[PDB]
């Protein structure tokens, strides 16, 4: 078990455009395409996030609103998304210290959250954060469970919380 395996569990691996838990068009391992309630815009965004990587340097690659993706391709986006989330943590005044104090397993729980709701979204967890910092596992678990994050995505939050509470991979086993 590891952060990649964790997010693959929690996000799945879909090679065809799908919708998030908010109804938004997404692809790969939880890569948001657009908030527009339009499949067309999605493709458009997809055919822009796909050719963008190895776009200009050399010959073409496709250029066609198919809506499907290559595992490797999904992988790439996945690797960028995770890198982004990690750097959002490090760059965040509030998330950084909490992260710094955490152990490897709890660290991916933090990444996991950042990856799901964004840097600012996680940083707004004033209590939970301070408790994580103080190593008050039980207390932080309880607070997080009282959030709207948990409310909307219970299954996932529980897993995440179990990870914060125990410091083990039990929930993903």
mmCIF file of C-alpha atoms in Angstrom:
data_model
loop_
_atom_site.group_PDB
_atom_site.id
_atom_site.type_symbol
_atom_site.label_atom_id
_atom_site.label_comp_id
_atom_site.label_asym_id
_atom_site.label_seq_id
_atom_site.Cartn_x
_atom_site.Cartn_y
_atom_site.Cartn_z
ATOM 1 C CA UNK A 1 0.000 0.000 0.000
ATOM 2 C CA UNK A 2 1.091 3.540 -0.853
ATOM 3 C CA UNK A 3 -0.273 6.910 -1.789
ATOM 4 C CA UNK A 4 -0.631 5.962 -5.426
ATOM 5 C CA UNK A 5 -2.524 2.746 -4.583
ATOM 6 C CA UNK A 6 -4.631 4.742 -2.107
ATOM 7 C CA UNK A 7 -5.744 7.332 -4.622
ATOM 8 C CA UNK A 8 -6.294 4.587 -7.210
ATOM 9 C CA UNK A 9 -8.636 2.967 -4.752
ATOM 10 C CA UNK A 10 -10.449 6.165 -3.767
ATOM 11 C CA UNK A 11 -10.630 7.636 -7.304
ATOM 12 C CA UNK A 12 -10.625 4.499 -9.405
ATOM 13 C CA UNK A 13 -9.119 4.360 -12.854
ATOM 14 C CA UNK A 14 -11.508 5.352 -15.566
ATOM 15 C CA UNK A 15 -10.201 5.613 -19.132
ATOM 16 C CA UNK A 16 -13.437 7.169 -20.423
ATOM 17 C CA UNK A 17 -14.938 10.498 -19.374
ATOM 18 C CA UNK A 18 -17.075 10.156 -16.224
ATOM 19 C CA UNK A 19 -18.544 12.348 -13.512
ATOM 20 C CA UNK A 20 -17.226 13.195 -10.049
ATOM 21 C CA UNK A 21 -19.256 13.035 -6.871
ATOM 22 C CA UNK A 22 -20.236 16.646 -7.688
ATOM 23 C CA UNK A 23 -21.430 15.712 -11.193
ATOM 24 C CA UNK A 24 -18.385 17.234 -12.935
ATOM 25 C CA UNK A 25 -16.744 15.688 -15.976
ATOM 26 C CA UNK A 26 -13.574 13.874 -15.020
ATOM 27 C CA UNK A 27 -11.184 11.338 -16.516
ATOM 28 C CA UNK A 28 -8.351 9.017 -15.495
ATOM 29 C CA UNK A 29 -7.621 8.776 -11.824
ATOM 30 C CA UNK A 30 -9.796 11.668 -10.739
ATOM 31 C CA UNK A 31 -8.635 14.398 -13.093
ATOM 32 C CA UNK A 32 -11.258 17.230 -13.319
ATOM 33 C CA UNK A 33 -11.958 18.308 -16.939
ATOM 34 C CA UNK A 34 -14.601 20.978 -16.613
ATOM 35 C CA UNK A 35 -17.465 22.152 -14.457
ATOM 36 C CA UNK A 36 -19.555 22.825 -17.544
ATOM 37 C CA UNK A 37 -22.502 20.513 -17.744
ATOM 38 C CA UNK A 38 -21.388 19.800 -21.260
ATOM 39 C CA UNK A 39 -19.749 16.650 -22.613
ATOM 40 C CA UNK A 40 -18.497 18.687 -25.518
ATOM 41 C CA UNK A 41 -16.512 21.069 -23.344
ATOM 42 C CA UNK A 42 -15.113 18.024 -21.530
ATOM 43 C CA UNK A 43 -13.754 16.482 -24.706
ATOM 44 C CA UNK A 44 -12.457 19.900 -25.656
ATOM 45 C CA UNK A 45 -10.654 20.199 -22.356
ATOM 46 C CA UNK A 46 -9.483 16.576 -22.656
ATOM 47 C CA UNK A 47 -8.058 17.073 -26.165
ATOM 48 C CA UNK A 48 -6.154 19.965 -24.632
ATOM 49 C CA UNK A 49 -4.813 18.277 -21.533
ATOM 50 C CA UNK A 50 -3.736 15.306 -23.570
ATOM 51 C CA UNK A 51 -1.942 16.778 -26.517
ATOM 52 C CA UNK A 52 -0.557 19.517 -24.308
ATOM 53 C CA UNK A 53 2.113 17.317 -22.764
ATOM 54 C CA UNK A 54 4.056 16.462 -25.931
ATOM 55 C CA UNK A 55 2.259 19.051 -28.049
ATOM 56 C CA UNK A 56 4.672 21.132 -30.104
ATOM 57 C CA UNK A 57 8.252 19.825 -29.994
ATOM 58 C CA UNK A 58 7.539 17.246 -32.707
ATOM 59 C CA UNK A 59 4.988 15.734 -35.085
ATOM 60 C CA UNK A 60 1.287 15.404 -34.310
ATOM 61 C CA UNK A 61 -0.363 12.784 -32.123
ATOM 62 C CA UNK A 62 -4.064 12.720 -32.943
ATOM 63 C CA UNK A 63 -6.279 15.775 -32.595
ATOM 64 C CA UNK A 64 -9.788 14.327 -32.348
ATOM 65 C CA UNK A 65 -12.539 14.584 -29.717
ATOM 66 C CA UNK A 66 -12.709 10.891 -28.853
ATOM 67 C CA UNK A 67 -13.128 11.124 -25.080
ATOM 68 C CA UNK A 68 -11.038 8.034 -24.339
ATOM 69 C CA UNK A 69 -7.635 7.939 -22.752
ATOM 70 C CA UNK A 70 -4.459 5.863 -22.585
ATOM 71 C CA UNK A 71 -3.575 4.230 -19.298
ATOM 72 C CA UNK A 72 -0.153 5.758 -19.618
ATOM 73 C CA UNK A 73 -1.874 9.023 -20.367
ATOM 74 C CA UNK A 74 -4.097 8.741 -17.330
ATOM 75 C CA UNK A 75 -0.950 7.922 -15.424
ATOM 76 C CA UNK A 76 0.721 11.135 -16.564
ATOM 77 C CA UNK A 77 -2.166 13.343 -15.516
ATOM 78 C CA UNK A 78 -2.241 11.359 -12.240
ATOM 79 C CA UNK A 79 1.414 12.095 -11.636
ATOM 80 C CA UNK A 80 0.886 15.833 -12.270
ATOM 81 C CA UNK A 81 -2.234 16.004 -10.049
ATOM 82 C CA UNK A 82 -0.463 14.336 -7.118
ATOM 83 C CA UNK A 83 2.648 16.518 -7.599
ATOM 84 C CA UNK A 84 0.408 19.545 -7.640
ATOM 85 C CA UNK A 85 -1.326 18.543 -4.384
ATOM 86 C CA UNK A 86 1.957 17.895 -2.714
ATOM 87 C CA UNK A 87 3.362 21.290 -3.707
ATOM 88 C CA UNK A 88 0.069 22.953 -2.561
ATOM 89 C CA UNK A 89 0.641 21.480 0.869
ATOM 90 C CA UNK A 90 4.335 22.647 1.079
ATOM 91 C CA UNK A 91 3.376 26.125 -0.207
ATOM 92 C CA UNK A 92 0.475 26.467 2.239
ATOM 93 C CA UNK A 93 1.219 28.249 5.500
ATOM 94 C CA UNK A 94 -1.346 26.188 7.411
ATOM 95 C CA UNK A 95 -0.821 22.760 5.810
ATOM 96 C CA UNK A 96 2.977 22.773 5.748
ATOM 97 C CA UNK A 97 3.732 22.441 9.449
ATOM 98 C CA UNK A 98 1.059 19.866 9.953
ATOM 99 C CA UNK A 99 2.485 17.886 7.077
ATOM 100 C CA UNK A 100 6.025 18.295 8.370
ATOM 101 C CA UNK A 101 5.123 16.829 11.681
ATOM 102 C CA UNK A 102 3.256 13.864 10.257
ATOM 103 C CA UNK A 103 4.498 10.359 9.636
ATOM 104 C CA UNK A 104 4.660 8.823 6.111
ATOM 105 C CA UNK A 105 1.253 7.159 6.349
ATOM 106 C CA UNK A 106 -0.564 10.151 7.711
ATOM 107 C CA UNK A 107 1.235 12.277 5.074
ATOM 108 C CA UNK A 108 -0.584 10.532 2.284
ATOM 109 C CA UNK A 109 -3.793 10.976 4.110
ATOM 110 C CA UNK A 110 -3.110 14.683 3.895
ATOM 111 C CA UNK A 111 -2.117 14.494 0.178
ATOM 112 C CA UNK A 112 -5.243 12.454 -0.434
ATOM 113 C CA UNK A 113 -7.408 15.227 1.055
ATOM 114 C CA UNK A 114 -5.578 17.984 -0.795
ATOM 115 C CA UNK A 115 -6.038 15.996 -3.989
ATOM 116 C CA UNK A 116 -9.737 15.769 -3.429
ATOM 117 C CA UNK A 117 -10.713 19.250 -2.358
ATOM 118 C CA UNK A 118 -7.795 21.547 -2.952
ATOM 119 C CA UNK A 119 -5.259 23.429 -0.835
ATOM 120 C CA UNK A 120 -7.589 26.097 0.490
ATOM 121 C CA UNK A 121 -10.339 23.566 0.992
ATOM 122 C CA UNK A 122 -8.196 21.520 3.386
ATOM 123 C CA UNK A 123 -6.549 24.484 5.101
ATOM 124 C CA UNK A 124 -9.996 25.556 6.327
ATOM 125 C CA UNK A 125 -9.985 22.596 8.719
ATOM 126 C CA UNK A 126 -8.692 24.686 11.622
ATOM 127 C CA UNK A 127 -9.393 22.243 14.430
ATOM 128 C CA UNK A 128 -8.585 18.940 12.799
ATOM 129 C CA UNK A 129 -5.327 20.441 11.613
ATOM 130 C CA UNK A 130 -4.202 21.681 15.044
ATOM 131 C CA UNK A 131 -5.117 18.314 16.528
ATOM 132 C CA UNK A 132 -3.165 16.439 13.890
ATOM 133 C CA UNK A 133 -0.233 18.641 14.783
ATOM 134 C CA UNK A 134 -0.609 17.752 18.453
ATOM 135 C CA UNK A 135 -0.940 14.084 17.587
ATOM 136 C CA UNK A 136 -4.447 13.990 18.973
ATOM 137 C CA UNK A 137 -5.554 11.289 16.555
ATOM 138 C CA UNK A 138 -8.866 10.462 18.177
ATOM 139 C CA UNK A 139 -9.788 14.119 18.591
ATOM 140 C CA UNK A 140 -8.903 14.939 14.957
ATOM 141 C CA UNK A 141 -10.779 11.942 13.722
ATOM 142 C CA UNK A 142 -13.910 13.027 15.609
ATOM 143 C CA UNK A 143 -13.706 16.552 14.226
ATOM 144 C CA UNK A 144 -13.171 15.557 10.669
ATOM 145 C CA UNK A 145 -16.157 13.160 10.887
ATOM 146 C CA UNK A 146 -18.314 16.176 11.815
ATOM 147 C CA UNK A 147 -17.386 17.981 8.637
ATOM 148 C CA UNK A 148 -19.312 18.399 5.425
ATOM 149 C CA UNK A 149 -16.586 16.570 3.618
ATOM 150 C CA UNK A 150 -17.476 13.461 5.537
ATOM 151 C CA UNK A 151 -21.162 14.137 5.060
ATOM 152 C CA UNK A 152 -20.922 14.310 1.263
ATOM 153 C CA UNK A 153 -18.302 11.526 0.805
ATOM 154 C CA UNK A 154 -18.559 9.339 3.884
ATOM 155 C CA UNK A 155 -17.031 6.154 2.465
ATOM 156 C CA UNK A 156 -13.893 8.022 1.397
ATOM 157 C CA UNK A 157 -13.669 10.300 4.415
ATOM 158 C CA UNK A 158 -13.958 7.318 6.783
ATOM 159 C CA UNK A 159 -11.050 5.631 5.052
ATOM 160 C CA UNK A 160 -9.030 8.830 5.221
ATOM 161 C CA UNK A 161 -9.928 9.388 8.883
ATOM 162 C CA UNK A 162 -9.083 5.766 9.779
ATOM 163 C CA UNK A 163 -5.692 6.535 8.239
ATOM 164 C CA UNK A 164 -5.286 9.675 10.330
ATOM 165 C CA UNK A 165 -6.536 7.900 13.476
ATOM 166 C CA UNK A 166 -4.440 4.754 13.207
ATOM 167 C CA UNK A 167 -1.447 5.698 11.096
ATOM 168 C CA UNK A 168 -1.939 2.345 9.374
ATOM 169 C CA UNK A 169 -3.279 1.217 5.988
ATOM 170 C CA UNK A 170 -5.958 -0.935 7.585
ATOM 171 C CA UNK A 171 -8.800 0.886 5.736
ATOM 172 C CA UNK A 172 -7.307 0.163 2.380
ATOM 173 C CA UNK A 173 -6.517 -3.443 3.165
#
